[PDB]
Paper text:
During the replicative cycle of retroviruses, the retrotranscribed viral DNA is integrated into the host chromosome by the viral [name] protein (IN). Retroviral IN consists of three domains: the zinc-binding N-terminal domain (NTD), the catalytic core domain (CCD) and the C-terminal domain (CTD). The central CCD contains an invariant D,D(35)E motif, which forms a catalytic triad with two sites that can coordinate various divalent cations (Mg(II), Mn(II), Zn(II), Cd(II), Ca(II)) although Mg(II) is the likely metal cofactor in vivo. Rous-associated virus type 1 (RAV-1) is a replication-competent alpharetrovirus, member of ASLV subgroup A; the INs of this retrovirus genus are a good model for HIV IN.
As a control, the [name] mutant of RAV-1 IN CCD (termed RAV-1 IN CCDA182T), corresponding to the RSV-A IN CCD sequence, was purified and the crystallization conditions for both RAV-1 IN CCD and RSV-A IN CCD were tested; that is, a MES buffer at pH 6.0 and a citrate buffer at pH 6.2, respectively. Large crystals were obtained with the second set of conditions. Further, the huge crystals of RAV-1 IN CCDA182T were isomorphous to those of RSV-A IN CCD obtained under the same conditions. They belonged to space group P43212 with one molecule in the asymmetric unit. Synchrotron data for these crystals were collected to 1.55 Å resolutions. The refined structure of RAV-1 IN CCDA182T contains 137 residues, 1 citrate molecule and 122 water molecules (right). The 145–152 loop is disordered and is not observed in the electron density map, as in RSV-A IN CCD. Thus, the tertiary structure of RAV-1 IN CCD is nearly identical to that of RSV-A IN CCD, equivalent to that of RAV-1 IN CCDA182T (r.m.s. deviation of 0.4 Å on 132 Cα pairs) and respects the ribonuclease H fold. The [name] substitution mostly affects the side-chain orientation of the neighboring Arg179 of the α4-α5 loop. This arginine is hydrogen bonded to the side-chain oxygen atom OG of Thr182 in RSV-A IN CCD, whereas a similar contact is impossible with the aliphatic Ala182 in RAV-1 IN CCD. Thus, the [name] substitution influences crystal assembly via Arg179 and, either large tetragonal crystals or tiny hexagonal microcrystals are observed for RAV-1 IN CCDA182T, whereas only hexagonal crystals are obtained for RAV-1 IN CCD.
Author numbering:
A (entry chain A), B (entry chain A): 55 to 144, 153 to 199
The structure:
């Protein structure tokens, strides 16, 4: 009787994480858990790479909600979701996630003395720490 | 009263994933969940990158068990674990994980017609699918 297995996914631009400043963000509407990956471009393949990670983390969802951006509605992405057996529909929860994540990234970056872009070699750990801070005790 | 929050972590070499063929593997001894990342070299920083991901995924553990490899016992890694407040001790569960993971990678690769090394552009999704298959329904 628990919540349905439905995600919302979006991309959000975060220059503190450049050059891979396109953050793909999934929120599990059941648990509120967030998965975020970084990408150098917003493409169908980026979305697919991100969901492959999100499935590794969260399991296989029944459905994913996105907007009607071309990277979500392309033949390529429609086929990839069909290959996984995931229903796709074309979002307040992921909008809130985007804000919580960008705020957390800024606080953690500034805490480490990075007032502008985060040095490339430090980004992966700082993004993972933001994800940890949003999801876990 | 649930299981203690203790991980085991190891590196295992998987040439099907070359050039980033060093797989860092954590198993949560509580749940049996596995986190795996790929690395081009086995270094203290690789271990730290891997645990940063594993914390994002699983939460912050109370302790991590490893062997006495230099990448785990270096000043750098001892300090990184202290920064996180994670107790470190210097492993059957992660050995089993290593085997389950390499077997799963081979089956999935061969299923996609890759009988030797997996093409670089396909590795990230295939590793994530192996992780998914081990952890989730």
């Amino acid at each position: 009787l628990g919540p349905l297995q439905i995600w919302q996914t979006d991309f959000t631009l975060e220059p503190r994480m450049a050059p891979r400043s396109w953050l793909a963000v999934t929120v599990d509407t059941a648990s509120s858990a967030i998965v975020v990956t970084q990408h150098g471009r917003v493409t169908s393949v980026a979305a697919q790479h991100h969901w492959a990670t999100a499935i590794a983390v969260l399991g296989r969802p029944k459905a994913i909600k996105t907007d009607n951006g071309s990277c979500f509605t392309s033949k390529s992405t429609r086929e990839w979701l069909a290959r996984w057996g995931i229903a796709h529909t074309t979002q307040a929860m992921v909008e809130r996630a985007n804000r919580l994540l960008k705020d957390k990234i800024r606080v953690l970056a500034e805490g480490d003395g990075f007032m502008k872009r985060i040095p490339t070699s430090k980004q992966g750990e700082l993004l993972a720490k933001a994800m940890y801070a949003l999801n876990h005790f």
